[PDB]
Amino acid sequence: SALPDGSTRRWENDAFKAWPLYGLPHHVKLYAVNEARYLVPAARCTAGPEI
Amino acid sequence: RLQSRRHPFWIDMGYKKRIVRIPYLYRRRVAKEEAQEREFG
Amino acid sequence: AQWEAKRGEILQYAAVVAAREVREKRKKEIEEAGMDLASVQPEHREQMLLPRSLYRKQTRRLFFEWRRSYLAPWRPGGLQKLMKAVVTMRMLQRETR
Amino acid sequence: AAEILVESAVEQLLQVDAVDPNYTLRKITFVDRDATNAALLAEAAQAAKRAWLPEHQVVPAPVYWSQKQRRLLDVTDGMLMFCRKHTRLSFKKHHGVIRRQKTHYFSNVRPFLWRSSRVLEPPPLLL
Amino acid sequence: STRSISGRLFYKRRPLQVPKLKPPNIRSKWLEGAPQKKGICVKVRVQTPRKPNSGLRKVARVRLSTGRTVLVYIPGIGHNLNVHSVVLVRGGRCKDVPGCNYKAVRGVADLLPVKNRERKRSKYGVKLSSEKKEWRLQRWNNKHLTIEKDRELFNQFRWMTWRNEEGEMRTSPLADDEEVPRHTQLFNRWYRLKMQREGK
Amino acid sequence: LVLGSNAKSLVDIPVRPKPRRFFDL
Amino acid sequence: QNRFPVLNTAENFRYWKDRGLDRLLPRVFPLKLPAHRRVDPLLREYIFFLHSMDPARFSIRKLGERYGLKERTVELICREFSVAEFLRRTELATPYTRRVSREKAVLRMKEALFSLKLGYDQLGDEDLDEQEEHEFRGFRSTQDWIQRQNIEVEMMSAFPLPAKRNPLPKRVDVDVTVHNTPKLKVMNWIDPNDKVVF
RNA sequence: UUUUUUUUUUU
RNA sequence: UUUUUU
RNA sequence: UUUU
RNA sequence: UUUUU
RNA sequence: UUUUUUUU
């Protein structure tokens, strides 16, 4: 390029996973499903309050 | 992996040595090959 | 945000800026160092006055020149100025009362 | 939780967050049945008193004396000639790897050890 | 097992059972524990090595200061020891020569000149660094080895603005017959700093 | 290796030392 | 064979770990970075100002609660900020040309790269106080240094079993300061093993 | 490898 | 002395 | 002595 | 030894 | 954005 510009900068393959962010959308959906499967022992526990 | 034992000073000096040494080796190899073709090939 | 959008505009503008300075500055250097440019090849006349090295270096330096606006949030005592002038307003009023 | 309460009481009295001071509230007390809790509460009070009243402002001894004998030193541009250095970065240039475990111990460890217990430097005294 | 412990005299029977001798330092035993011992030579001969090793090995019987005679090998080319000569011996075993378990020391010994021809092993041959060899280690200037790759690069981005050495900026690098100049700051940096410092 | 040593610099061209511009705290 | 739906079992311990042939497989891991550097530089100035203005109203603990910062982390922000400003006002040297070890130089590069990809954090995300939780912190966490045992064996019985022997605290020597003077520093050596106090 | 500290598990 | 570049 |  | 190109 | 990458 004739005009000096930083157009040659490129990201690295390992850079994407080196600085992750716990804000992506495709984790909440999976977490919700696991929540139901994790609380099943008490959901089907037809016992008294103590148990 | 085995740990390092050499003095830091020597370690650092090795990198400095290679700055001017390394380039000379590359040019020395091509000097013979390029000259051979210009007079025989 | 504005700066980012107008990146292309700014950079293109600064290209001609450096041309008027590099050409004039290089003309004096050759005159003091060299003897004359009358016997030089016409093809090399343009490259000598506007070399690809100074042109690219000056353009980058001049491009940044335009930058550095909004000097308020300056690390070396640029943020404290607003706070100092804000809080103090309330103190005078209170004192009077 | 204790520190929150105590710290809050003081501010009310002084009415810091008020453009128009309206002194109405001039009596704050805390009552606790539990003995254990009561004792703890007292501690909080002490901390509150510090850094607020000028009569209970502590200061370390090492810095207290330095602050007393204050002076104005004029440093010119030529006095910082030797302060600057050539190398940018710095790091240890000699590994701490010991060569002789016994020879060094009986030359620079035993003479400098006069106690049979490992004791670290005590904290400074507050004045 | 614990079968050897039986009996009220276990503290006097077990301990008296020595396993073996001391294999190490079994040959060099006439030195009386001294690292080195001086001696005098009284016999010079040439002992033929055992088979299948052929050739001839030079040896000499050196009389130790402790009144004991033992053969000693003289490694290295040449020979200068004669009858009634003082030479310092040391440890070392020779497989080719049977019985010999000592070696001579060059230099420190008496009337033992330096080796004839040797450059690789210096300490071994007690050879001091010659003045000629020392001067050769200081000559380091072989950096000027430009190639065609440098020629093209120079006449693309380093020919417009470039300061020469003497007094001139614009040069003629495009000419094939001409030679591209060298760097005035980086080329030959180590040699220049050392030579300019000793000049005082 | 065809070029040996023809033009050499020994004392003719001096070397400028490195200036000091890194203040140490 | 057994039912135990929890997250503190033998198999569930150290979840997402290579157990088999995957140990030798190369895997990329995130790069750690201190919290006091991930915060927005802008906010650091603000925080420092407050501290230096009124330490009484703006205490070290109260200031860190609003922005969600630990007592130890907030202390470094003021200390690191102070020195940076001191060299600029006094016209001593620029921060870029400041001398520092190589360990900090690499840290600075990561801080700049962290924001260039994601961006600076407007507010810290950390708990002021700790919480007792089951986590793997080194190899010295899942070991009993008092009894020096890994596997606990006990008798199976419904009746109350006798309790175990409780350990005693280790008595060690300490030092305290009594009188401090500019030209002398007096200290006292405490010996807890001495029966007579006097 | 800590500005005002002689304190600091600095890393 | 050149190249690259929040 | 890039603290004599 | 010398030192802001 | 600092004589930054860059190294007596």
mmCIF file of C-alpha atoms in Angstrom, chain E:
data_model
loop_
_atom_site.group_PDB
_atom_site.id
_atom_site.type_symbol
_atom_site.label_atom_id
_atom_site.label_comp_id
_atom_site.label_asym_id
_atom_site.label_seq_id
_atom_site.Cartn_x
_atom_site.Cartn_y
_atom_site.Cartn_z
ATOM 1 C CA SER E 1 18.019 -63.001 57.073
ATOM 2 C CA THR E 2 18.996 -62.667 60.738
ATOM 3 C CA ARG E 3 20.714 -66.010 61.164
ATOM 4 C CA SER E 4 24.106 -64.416 61.716
ATOM 5 C CA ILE E 5 22.981 -62.469 64.768
ATOM 6 C CA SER E 6 22.393 -65.497 66.967
ATOM 7 C CA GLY E 7 24.602 -65.864 70.020
ATOM 8 C CA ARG E 8 25.645 -63.559 72.844
ATOM 9 C CA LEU E 9 28.892 -62.748 70.974
ATOM 10 C CA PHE E 10 27.156 -61.176 67.962
ATOM 11 C CA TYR E 11 29.183 -57.995 68.600
ATOM 12 C CA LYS E 12 32.489 -59.804 67.932
ATOM 13 C CA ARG E 13 31.715 -62.332 65.148
ATOM 14 C CA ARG E 14 29.831 -60.373 62.476
ATOM 15 C CA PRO E 15 32.115 -57.334 62.465
ATOM 16 C CA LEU E 16 35.195 -59.521 61.882
ATOM 17 C CA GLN E 17 33.921 -60.710 58.469
ATOM 18 C CA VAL E 18 35.556 -58.321 56.002
ATOM 19 C CA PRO E 19 33.874 -58.430 52.566
ATOM 20 C CA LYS E 20 36.780 -57.675 50.286
ATOM 21 C CA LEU E 21 39.861 -55.503 49.819
ATOM 22 C CA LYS E 22 40.077 -51.994 48.294
ATOM 23 C CA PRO E 23 40.125 -52.350 44.473
ATOM 24 C CA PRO E 24 40.689 -48.606 43.975
ATOM 25 C CA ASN E 25 44.206 -47.246 44.450
ATOM 26 C CA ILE E 26 45.599 -50.784 44.470
ATOM 27 C CA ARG E 27 48.405 -50.172 41.949
ATOM 28 C CA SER E 28 49.790 -46.846 43.197
ATOM 29 C CA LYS E 29 50.765 -47.922 46.723
ATOM 30 C CA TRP E 30 54.496 -47.092 46.924
ATOM 31 C CA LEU E 31 53.869 -43.324 47.116
ATOM 32 C CA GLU E 32 53.074 -43.595 50.858
ATOM 33 C CA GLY E 33 49.927 -41.581 50.167
ATOM 34 C CA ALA E 34 51.780 -38.621 48.656
ATOM 35 C CA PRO E 35 50.331 -37.179 45.432
ATOM 36 C CA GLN E 36 53.755 -37.170 43.843
ATOM 37 C CA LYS E 37 57.249 -38.388 44.708
ATOM 38 C CA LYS E 38 60.595 -37.472 43.170
ATOM 39 C CA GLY E 39 63.075 -40.061 41.955
ATOM 40 C CA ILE E 40 66.250 -40.679 39.982
ATOM 41 C CA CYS E 41 66.687 -42.854 36.896
ATOM 42 C CA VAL E 42 69.417 -45.506 36.839
ATOM 43 C CA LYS E 43 68.349 -47.711 33.906
ATOM 44 C CA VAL E 44 66.997 -46.922 30.434
ATOM 45 C CA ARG E 45 65.634 -49.697 28.211
ATOM 46 C CA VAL E 46 62.940 -50.366 25.603
ATOM 47 C CA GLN E 47 60.300 -52.898 26.661
ATOM 48 C CA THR E 48 58.320 -54.695 23.957
ATOM 49 C CA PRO E 49 54.543 -54.588 24.579
ATOM 50 C CA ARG E 50 52.583 -57.801 24.940
ATOM 51 C CA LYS E 51 50.670 -59.302 22.033
ATOM 52 C CA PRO E 52 48.763 -58.503 19.914
ATOM 53 C CA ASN E 53 50.116 -54.967 20.408
ATOM 54 C CA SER E 54 53.253 -54.578 18.288
ATOM 55 C CA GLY E 55 55.841 -51.802 18.193
ATOM 56 C CA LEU E 56 58.263 -50.601 20.844
ATOM 57 C CA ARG E 57 57.597 -48.527 23.967
ATOM 58 C CA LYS E 58 60.300 -46.538 25.750
ATOM 59 C CA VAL E 59 60.535 -47.111 29.514
ATOM 60 C CA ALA E 60 62.990 -46.341 32.302
ATOM 61 C CA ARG E 61 63.513 -47.681 35.822
ATOM 62 C CA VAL E 62 63.173 -44.727 38.213
ATOM 63 C CA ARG E 63 64.339 -45.065 41.820
ATOM 64 C CA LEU E 64 61.924 -43.364 44.204
ATOM 65 C CA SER E 65 63.164 -41.252 47.103
ATOM 66 C CA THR E 66 61.797 -43.924 49.476
ATOM 67 C CA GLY E 67 64.427 -46.422 48.309
ATOM 68 C CA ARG E 68 62.136 -48.315 45.924
ATOM 69 C CA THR E 69 62.586 -48.962 42.200
ATOM 70 C CA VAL E 70 59.677 -49.172 39.758
ATOM 71 C CA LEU E 71 59.361 -48.836 35.995
ATOM 72 C CA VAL E 72 57.925 -45.579 34.653
ATOM 73 C CA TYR E 73 56.603 -44.701 31.201
ATOM 74 C CA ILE E 74 57.691 -41.589 29.299
ATOM 75 C CA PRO E 75 54.720 -40.507 27.145
ATOM 76 C CA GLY E 76 55.252 -38.062 24.317
ATOM 77 C CA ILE E 77 57.527 -37.927 21.295
ATOM 78 C CA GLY E 78 61.267 -37.599 21.790
ATOM 79 C CA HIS E 79 63.511 -38.744 24.611
ATOM 80 C CA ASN E 80 65.964 -36.922 26.873
ATOM 81 C CA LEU E 81 66.286 -39.033 30.047
ATOM 82 C CA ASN E 82 69.653 -40.706 30.615
ATOM 83 C CA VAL E 83 71.539 -42.442 33.429
ATOM 84 C CA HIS E 84 71.496 -40.587 36.765
ATOM 85 C CA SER E 85 68.679 -38.187 35.908
ATOM 86 C CA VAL E 86 66.084 -36.767 38.296
ATOM 87 C CA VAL E 87 62.468 -37.028 37.124
ATOM 88 C CA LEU E 88 59.157 -36.546 38.929
ATOM 89 C CA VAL E 89 56.663 -39.404 38.592
ATOM 90 C CA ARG E 90 52.901 -39.575 39.118
ATOM 91 C CA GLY E 91 50.026 -41.950 38.986
ATOM 92 C CA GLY E 92 48.879 -43.871 35.997
ATOM 93 C CA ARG E 93 48.578 -47.388 34.657
ATOM 94 C CA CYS E 94 49.883 -48.651 31.311
ATOM 95 C CA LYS E 95 48.147 -51.640 29.734
ATOM 96 C CA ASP E 96 50.720 -52.188 26.976
ATOM 97 C CA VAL E 97 53.642 -52.277 29.433
ATOM 98 C CA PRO E 98 53.099 -54.995 32.077
ATOM 99 C CA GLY E 99 53.907 -54.047 35.662
ATOM 100 C CA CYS E 100 54.410 -50.341 34.984
ATOM 101 C CA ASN E 101 51.986 -48.320 37.128
ATOM 102 C CA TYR E 102 53.561 -44.856 37.031
ATOM 103 C CA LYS E 103 54.022 -41.954 34.639
ATOM 104 C CA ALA E 104 56.517 -39.109 34.355
ATOM 105 C CA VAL E 105 55.757 -35.386 34.428
ATOM 106 C CA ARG E 106 57.234 -32.985 31.871
ATOM 107 C CA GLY E 107 58.356 -29.466 32.713
ATOM 108 C CA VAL E 108 58.266 -29.608 36.507
ATOM 109 C CA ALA E 109 60.863 -32.385 36.378
ATOM 110 C CA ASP E 110 64.600 -31.710 36.192
ATOM 111 C CA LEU E 111 66.560 -31.669 32.916
ATOM 112 C CA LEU E 112 63.367 -32.490 30.990
ATOM 113 C CA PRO E 113 62.823 -30.049 28.089
ATOM 114 C CA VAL E 114 59.453 -29.210 26.523
ATOM 115 C CA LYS E 115 57.839 -31.323 23.809
ATOM 116 C CA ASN E 116 58.998 -31.061 20.202
ATOM 117 C CA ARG E 117 55.764 -30.546 18.232
ATOM 118 C CA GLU E 118 52.371 -30.118 19.898
ATOM 119 C CA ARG E 119 49.635 -27.491 19.641
ATOM 120 C CA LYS E 120 46.395 -29.226 20.646
ATOM 121 C CA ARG E 121 47.453 -30.386 24.117
ATOM 122 C CA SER E 122 49.101 -27.494 25.979
ATOM 123 C CA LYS E 123 48.944 -28.301 29.693
ATOM 124 C CA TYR E 124 49.683 -31.953 29.120
ATOM 125 C CA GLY E 125 52.844 -31.184 27.214
ATOM 126 C CA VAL E 126 53.737 -28.339 29.601
ATOM 127 C CA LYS E 127 53.949 -26.083 26.534
ATOM 128 C CA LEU E 128 53.526 -22.350 27.082
ATOM 129 C CA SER E 129 51.505 -20.211 24.689
ATOM 130 C CA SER E 130 53.866 -18.881 22.031
ATOM 131 C CA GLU E 131 53.831 -15.210 21.075
ATOM 132 C CA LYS E 132 53.027 -16.039 17.441
ATOM 133 C CA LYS E 133 49.965 -18.098 18.388
ATOM 134 C CA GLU E 134 48.669 -15.417 20.763
ATOM 135 C CA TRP E 135 48.807 -12.740 18.050
ATOM 136 C CA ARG E 136 46.706 -14.873 15.683
ATOM 137 C CA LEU E 137 43.782 -15.093 18.122
ATOM 138 C CA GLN E 138 43.363 -11.294 18.003
ATOM 139 C CA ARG E 139 42.903 -10.982 14.216
ATOM 140 C CA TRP E 140 39.129 -11.030 13.551
ATOM 141 C CA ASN E 141 38.031 -9.191 10.394
ATOM 142 C CA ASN E 142 36.247 -11.278 7.750
ATOM 143 C CA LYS E 143 32.784 -9.699 7.645
ATOM 144 C CA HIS E 144 32.844 -8.168 4.141
ATOM 145 C CA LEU E 145 31.134 -10.933 2.151
ATOM 146 C CA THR E 146 28.265 -9.216 0.324
ATOM 147 C CA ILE E 147 26.253 -11.180 -2.253
ATOM 148 C CA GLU E 148 23.808 -10.515 -5.084
ATOM 149 C CA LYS E 149 20.908 -10.375 -2.613
ATOM 150 C CA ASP E 150 22.398 -7.337 -0.866
ATOM 151 C CA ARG E 151 23.046 -5.578 -4.187
ATOM 152 C CA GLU E 152 19.375 -5.641 -5.208
ATOM 153 C CA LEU E 153 18.145 -4.599 -1.756
ATOM 154 C CA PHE E 154 20.629 -1.718 -1.555
ATOM 155 C CA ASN E 155 19.450 -0.227 -4.870
ATOM 156 C CA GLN E 156 15.781 -0.336 -3.883
ATOM 157 C CA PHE E 157 15.474 1.424 -0.512
ATOM 158 C CA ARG E 158 19.021 2.426 0.536
ATOM 159 C CA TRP E 159 20.306 4.290 -2.550
ATOM 160 C CA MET E 160 18.269 7.518 -2.400
ATOM 161 C CA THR E 161 19.433 8.770 1.016
ATOM 162 C CA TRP E 162 22.736 7.275 2.175
ATOM 163 C CA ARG E 163 25.753 8.993 3.725
ATOM 164 C CA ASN E 164 29.176 7.726 2.681
ATOM 165 C CA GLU E 165 32.310 7.924 4.854
ATOM 166 C CA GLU E 166 34.713 10.585 3.576
ATOM 167 C CA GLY E 167 32.583 13.589 2.622
ATOM 168 C CA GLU E 168 29.895 12.591 0.137
ATOM 169 C CA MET E 169 26.285 11.421 0.152
ATOM 170 C CA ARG E 170 25.412 10.405 -3.412
ATOM 171 C CA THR E 171 27.430 7.416 -4.636
ATOM 172 C CA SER E 172 27.262 5.005 -7.601
ATOM 173 C CA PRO E 173 26.106 1.609 -6.285
ATOM 174 C CA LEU E 174 24.100 0.790 -9.407
ATOM 175 C CA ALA E 175 27.303 0.225 -11.391
ATOM 176 C CA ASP E 176 28.138 -3.477 -11.523
ATOM 177 C CA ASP E 177 31.894 -2.833 -11.441
ATOM 178 C CA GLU E 178 31.509 -0.748 -8.271
ATOM 179 C CA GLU E 179 31.495 -2.268 -4.781
ATOM 180 C CA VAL E 180 28.851 -1.403 -2.189
ATOM 181 C CA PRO E 181 30.414 0.410 0.816
ATOM 182 C CA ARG E 182 30.324 -0.987 4.361
ATOM 183 C CA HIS E 183 28.537 0.177 7.500
ATOM 184 C CA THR E 184 30.357 2.880 9.482
ATOM 185 C CA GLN E 185 28.737 2.027 12.837
ATOM 186 C CA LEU E 186 28.106 -1.730 13.016
ATOM 187 C CA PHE E 187 30.640 -3.396 10.704
ATOM 188 C CA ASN E 188 33.760 -4.432 12.642
ATOM 189 C CA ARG E 189 32.482 -3.240 16.017
ATOM 190 C CA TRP E 190 34.313 -5.644 18.344
ATOM 191 C CA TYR E 191 37.711 -5.200 16.676
ATOM 192 C CA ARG E 192 37.437 -1.400 16.489
ATOM 193 C CA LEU E 193 36.589 -0.995 20.183
ATOM 194 C CA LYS E 194 39.540 -3.113 21.337
ATOM 195 C CA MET E 195 42.155 -1.531 19.060
ATOM 196 C CA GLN E 196 41.109 2.041 19.894
ATOM 197 C CA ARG E 197 41.236 1.312 23.644
ATOM 198 C CA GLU E 198 44.744 -0.161 23.904
ATOM 199 C CA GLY E 199 46.112 2.903 22.103
ATOM 200 C CA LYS E 200 46.877 4.859 25.269
#
